[model samples]
Target: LSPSARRVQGALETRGFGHLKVVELPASTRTAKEAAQAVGAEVGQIVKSLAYGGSKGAYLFLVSGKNRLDLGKAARLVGTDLLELDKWAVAALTGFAAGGVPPVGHNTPLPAYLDEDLLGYPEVWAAGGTPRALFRATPKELLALTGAQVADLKEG
Candidate 1:
């Protein structure tokens, strides 16, 4: 696994996700489609852990790969104007690059909102601290770890 992926693994272990297994990929899983194809999972089973600058501060949004975030609706849901964070800010906030940010193990815990769509799948894949690594988990596992509020954050 890559150094960043190793760090993510350690972080997950520290956060009581020791049972989870981290998978190292030979190719980059930068896009949700790429990750799903690499893992032999459906796009909906891929979790996109995106960072955003909100009115209050930085926050994380855990949405299904098959879905697009509706910024306006998200703003209404969180009661804050949310803007996409740049690469630098995303790394600074999540301690991971934009394409590899995990749902948890951020530099500091940020408010996380999860898409209800992801719950339709029995399992999902998430970035493992790097663009070339991934981890598999259930929706329940994510909810337990991320403490994310389930909502309809996807574009219609």
Candidate 2:
């Protein structure tokens, strides 16, 4: 695992996710689909942890790979416009690169919106705080760990 990914693993361990499994894979051209394809899991089982800034500051969004986030609708749901952050801003805010941002273990807890779709998967893989690393967890594991709020935040 890369240094960043290892840091995330350590962070998870500190947060009581020591038993969670971390998987390393060749970098994909896109989101969690690369990891899912490598492990033979369905796209929906892939958790894409994305970050964006808004009126409330930077926040995290966990969406299933099978679906896309409706930012406009999400903004409405949060009662603010979607404030998209650039690469540098993302790294600065979350201490991870754009594609490898994890849902937790940040210097601060970014408000998170988890798509309900990912709940269907028995095992979900999210970026292990690095582009080429991932970790396995269940939806319940995510909610319990991050205090994430589940919602219908994806679009076709």
Candidate 3:
């Protein structure tokens, strides 16, 4: 997680989201829901950048921690009408392994989707690329860095 977070911080700086400082946390045994609580942020303010495999390729999904994206339902909403990629494919497509991929700085231009729900927050935190670190960023900046479309963060 630390590597991913550092990679994301570097990417965010490259894309100019440097204004939002990054916060590093000690490695935690908590789930995403618990992480938000540890940081004292509303679950929605916690940016959960998840990676998933898709028919077109591997892409990142930024979701609000408050609501589960419902991957099954999301698959239908992604607009591609394609099936989700398996874990093996996900690793092959994105250099970072699962539980640690960032929304940007991938090996290729993987299609990305940002959950519209996160736009409501003025500042949100996402994995710095690793589990040990996180970066605070604006929804707009994160979107710009990923060149992500504001659509379904899940398959649907």
Candidate 1 lDDT, 1-156, residue by residue in tens? 688888888988999889998888876446677777877999898888978887688777898888988988788887888887889888888888877888877887898889999999888988898777889999999999999999999989
Identify the runs in model 1 with alpha carbons over 4 angstroms from their true place.
none
Q: Which candidate gets the maximum TM-score versus the true structure?
A: 1
Report lDDT per candidate: 0.85, 0.81, 0.67
| Residue-level lDDT tens digits of model 2 in 102-122 | 877787678888899888878
- What tens digits encode model 3's per-residue C-alpha lDDT throughout 69-145? 66765566554444555667656666666665666666666767788888888877776555555667788888877
Stronger candidate by lDDT (1 vs 3): 1
Quick one: RMSD of model 2?
1.6
TM-score, ranked from best to worst: 1, 2, 3
TM-scores of all predicted structures: 0.95, 0.92, 0.77
